[PDB]
């Protein structure tokens, strides 16, 4: 009756860790893609810029 609760809390922590890893990966990848897109936009704007 006590090992049940212990195992429940245990599996909860494990699931927390897995979900954290997955969500962090997703967020990181989205941010990196956005940064790359911004870099390309800046490249085209520098090709279009004018002055001296």
């Amino acid at each position: 009756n006590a090992f049940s609760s212990f195992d429940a809390c245990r599996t909860g922590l494990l699931k927390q860790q897995s979900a954290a890893v997955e969500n962090s990966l997703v967020r990181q990848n989205m941010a990196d893609v956005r940064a790359k897109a911004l870099f390309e936009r800046r490249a085209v704007l520098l090709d279009l810029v004018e002055g001296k």
């Binding site: 609760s5 195992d7 429940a8 809390c9 245990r10 599996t11 909860g12 922590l13 699931k15 927390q16």
Partner: protein, 112 residues
Amino acid sequence: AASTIPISQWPSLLYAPPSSPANPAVEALPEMQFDDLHYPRQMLLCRGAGYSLEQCNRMAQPDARVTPENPAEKLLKEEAVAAIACLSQREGGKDEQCRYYIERMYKLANKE
């Protein structure tokens, strides 16, 4: 008369406060509880058991480990209802219009 309480006497001030016209139950102050971990812990345990979020939210229940209920609400029920009726009818007991019921309750609860 009411002298300053230094910061070192605050822990005792919390569980033995000075007298006031509206005092709390000092004997019950160690029994006042309100768990901020109730629902997080419930969800964690259920998800570890293997249930889904919807099942967890349907099985969730509010915490019973809260501050106990006042026994007066069960012992002085009729007198309290009568006092509340008097107040509702007499504008909150202005100019001592519910003194009757209030004094009956006070006597019942205090006994000199």
